Amino acid sequence: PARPAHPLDPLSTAEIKAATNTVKSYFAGKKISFNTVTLREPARKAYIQWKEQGGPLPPRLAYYVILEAGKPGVKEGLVDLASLSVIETRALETVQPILTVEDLCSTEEVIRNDPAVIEQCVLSGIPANEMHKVYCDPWTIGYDERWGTGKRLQQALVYYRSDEDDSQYSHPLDFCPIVDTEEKKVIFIDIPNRRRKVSKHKHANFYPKHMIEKVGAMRPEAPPINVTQPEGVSFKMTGNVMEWSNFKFHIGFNYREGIVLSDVSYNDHGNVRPIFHRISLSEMIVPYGSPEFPHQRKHALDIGEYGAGYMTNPLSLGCDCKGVIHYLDAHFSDRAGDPITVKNAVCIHEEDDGLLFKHSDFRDNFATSLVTRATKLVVSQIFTAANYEYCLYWVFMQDGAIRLDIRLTGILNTYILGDDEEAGPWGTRVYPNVNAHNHQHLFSLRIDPRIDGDGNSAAACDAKSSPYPLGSPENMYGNAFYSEKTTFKTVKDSLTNYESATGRSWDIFNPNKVNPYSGKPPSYKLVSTQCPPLLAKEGSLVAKRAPWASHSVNVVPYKDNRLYPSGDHVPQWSGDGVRGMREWIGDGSENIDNTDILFFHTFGITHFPAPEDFPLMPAEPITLMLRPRHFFTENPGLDIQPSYAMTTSEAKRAV
Amino acid sequence: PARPAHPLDPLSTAEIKAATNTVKSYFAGKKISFNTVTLREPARKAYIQWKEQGGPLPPRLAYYVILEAGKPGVKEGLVDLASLSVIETRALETVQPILTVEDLCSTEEVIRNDPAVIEQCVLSGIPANEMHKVYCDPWTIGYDERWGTGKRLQQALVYYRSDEDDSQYSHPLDFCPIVDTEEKKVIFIDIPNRRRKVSKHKHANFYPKHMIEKVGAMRPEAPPINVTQPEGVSFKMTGNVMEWSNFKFHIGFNYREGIVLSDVSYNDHGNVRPIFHRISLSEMIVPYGSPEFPHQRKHALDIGEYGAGYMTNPLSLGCDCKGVIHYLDAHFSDRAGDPITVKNAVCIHEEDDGLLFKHSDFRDNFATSLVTRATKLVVSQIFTAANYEYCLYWVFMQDGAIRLDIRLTGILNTYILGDDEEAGPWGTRVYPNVNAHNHQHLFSLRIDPRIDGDGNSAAACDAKSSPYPLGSPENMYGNAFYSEKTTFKTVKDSLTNYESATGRSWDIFNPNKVNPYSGKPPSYKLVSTQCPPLLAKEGSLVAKRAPWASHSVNVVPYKDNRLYPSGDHVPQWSGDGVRGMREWIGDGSENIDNTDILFFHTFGITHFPAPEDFPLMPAEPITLMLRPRHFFTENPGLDIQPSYAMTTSEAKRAV
Ligand SMILES: [Cu+2]
Ligand SMILES: [Cu+2]
After folding, report:
1. What is the chain A residue with the closest CA to B500?
2. Which three-class secondary structure state does DSSP give residue B187?
3. Fold classified for A1-100
């Protein structure tokens, strides 16, 4: 296939087809299906050498995962696209791979046609001839110690719709079919000891036609707020390379992480300074907090088990993203090895962001005044994991800060509640016979930094009172305080949590350089306070399958292909074994001071549902920021034209 | 004077004049000056009776504070505006009041003409005939144990400008004149043991003309983003009463708190439900962290000592607030008893706020989809306390949540640093010879709640793992977790801090009512994580003068006139004595469960300056939110017209 404009560009549709033809030929005569066909990114060293040192062009490689009929687990490998050849391959008989949209599409018809499932619907109050009204959200089984990875399994969380336009989540059923993904058959049904028949209440609906019935009428359309950019946008795109307000970076995308931002630099008045080699979300875990069987199996690692790319929404013009928008499409492979496209998967636009800075002089009643307005650049996607919606916004700012904003919406996962059953303390009755279980949403932000170049370190920064007491010569009035910086020397040192007691932040810094004013190394500081402890206990299934989630920060040495901290193939892993973050941490002794490092940050929220969240939940925001501190020698935005500026002398001339 | 449209309306210019004429007549023959002339708000009970019970119209009252030449401290009292009479009066000989813009603009000429100050400038390298180049930020002395409240005092933080258009903060001088505010005389000068002469470096400037010299050129003007509302706005104002997206409230304003939001309710499909009686910022403290003399005196309580009203910027017009704006003016009294106006003190507008909610069905590739966009209502002011700018945004949202957003900007307070002097650990060298000291910015949000009516309580809510161990029948897989609610019974119980370990939130709730779905009381939940510990030690000046700041939450019984938690007259109070929050806490034993309560929340940031913050600092954000939880029985925004909606049936019809 033709070479891309840029080594980090995602595989084109032609490259995906070329890769799958190559793989089909290599396994000729075998019955195989495609699970993953994606860019294998060039080695970090090879990329930097190519980009900055006139070095070798890295080979264009595709990583694939396939299944073979009648063979356990998966096969994976690499295709060299230039030579149309498989160059690496291996069979992994004891793992299970990510569930694609197709993998999961099939489950509902399997359960609708299964005699044991039909029997359970009838027992639950749904007649056998109304199976078309039965739906399920096909989840990964997550992990079930009865089958391990020996079969590829889904669990069907079952619901009922009185009409196809209903939101089904007011009507969960009590039982849980277990489905063999590849054999397309129900192999078991978890049946509760206490049966609860289908709710007889009206569905809790949310479309305008439903709302008219429920509350009498919709609100009139509000007078509009119109955003226009009649002279175009300030950002410039060259293929997938973005240039805006001195930032330059590559916007990549894949089946798993969704948006991947690479080769991020800031043009500091002609001096182009690296900041990050790569930043993305690398895994998630959404652990539920009901201990009752089988609810322990609700702890989706959405990124590893379904994929933020696979799950991503086509973004419908003028609606999800308001204003003048640049869109990118996403390309994957289906099971047959044919390219599939999701149109308008990523939206790119710039937005007003209030004030950047202002100062006025009281001396002439603020006549002396300067105000400069802020614009932000937003690179966004929205993905749907069954009930949930995750709106993801990568935000670049004119003071050089970078922010990740997330908004959680969609629908609560619900289970049935008996008439006289108490949902607490593990959940909330959000509607009659509806129990919305407690759960956390946790994310693993993966940062491969290059703060002002190569050779970086990380530290925890804690605000502390002076150790000297009130009334001492050193602290006479007891007001002294400082920032205690703990530089991480080894992996073990880095395993740290957010602490409200010290308003903890973390620095990622270049110990080889010095700010000529402050004397401190250039850094980007992680400012992040939505950092829940992992509530699941040590040794729990949740804690074992997501070793990264137990600490707010994990810093490990860089190696190639250290992307996914719960391992490469997540579904049905028990959490036993040295893989992912557990492998990378090892015995905790490896050096992480002044070297190539990877910084994985766990953040998110703890959700205790309330009726406000039902039947459709208003957006709940999550955010973290990476701020330049001691990176610049002064406010980098001062060369932006103010919205208003008047000097003292000018103010005098006009009185 | 004519009666206002509404008992909570600020005093008009006519009422202010009427009040000062009354006071001058009462004190005829005496030489008095006006410090404060402001609405005395009606009693909570009287207001609610008037508003909701056809009760008596509360009298229209003005509170005043005056000084009298040759008398110590102040006099204060009340004027009944209908009868033009002083109805209450007292002398407070041992306090000092808020510093007005006039009180402060006087100081620079005092120091410029003082022989001892001139001598110090000369010693500092500034010739006697260049005193016009010497400037000072006149601060409250804060507290100095050498004078107590026996004289009304300011401390002059002295700077040098080479040219009138310079930003002076690159050039602090080493000494600190102490000025008697009322005698207009320097009484003392704090001189350091180690002298540091004025910096010989160029000023660190930030206007376009300066930037052209420094960096070569400004960036070209960006292509514009234009915001228009061609059919007008969705909000309606009747005088100061706002109506928007079912919210209704009164927008008040005063000299001290700035914006005061009152009588806040939500129209729940015809059922008008109270939320808050009053919400505002009630005090601040900005304690610096250098222990060296005289820097202990840098701990401004900006609200109590200068006033968020007095300090407020006239905004400015189509620049500070972008879009279609409704403005309010502010009115105060000057020293002579004449009304003064700040034009465009408050801006009111509505803004795009991204998505309100979304959900799509994977079954038909997200063809089944509903997306509804969010609009926010913003009521904002910006005030300047010498170097600092505080941008305050009260934000109402369509899910029924209320947010306070703050953006910090303006200029770092700076002190001189010697060539070879190390600024750390108490400050940062942000520019040659410039030391920007560490400091916190803390705010006291005052909430007078009325959650779904009268009789309220508050609680801490902590996320907790089940106490049952992994592998127990109760918690087999170790995943169970819940929210532990600790209802505050007495004042002492409420004295609580934010805790990262439990993701602590606080509920304000009505224990007299029950959500028909969840079974929980209706509540607004305080979600707030920017909650620094007070770093200054117990028994410190800072801790004593700001008793409220040592806990994230303080809940006390309602009584009338319990507004200001550091006392009514803040400057030069030593922090000794039972007044403000210390009085309201008492012995901690008073009931706060199911009664009229006041909830004071301490939030803010800890600032360790970096060169990025200089010479003018990019906005740093602070936020908290109050979210309805168990208040509604479902998402209250579902009757808002979606931006896009397609059902499953519609999707099938569209092929
Ligand atoms: Cu949730
Ligand atoms: Cu600050």
Report:
1. A500
2. strand
3. Nuclear Transport Factor 2; Chain: A, (3.10.450)
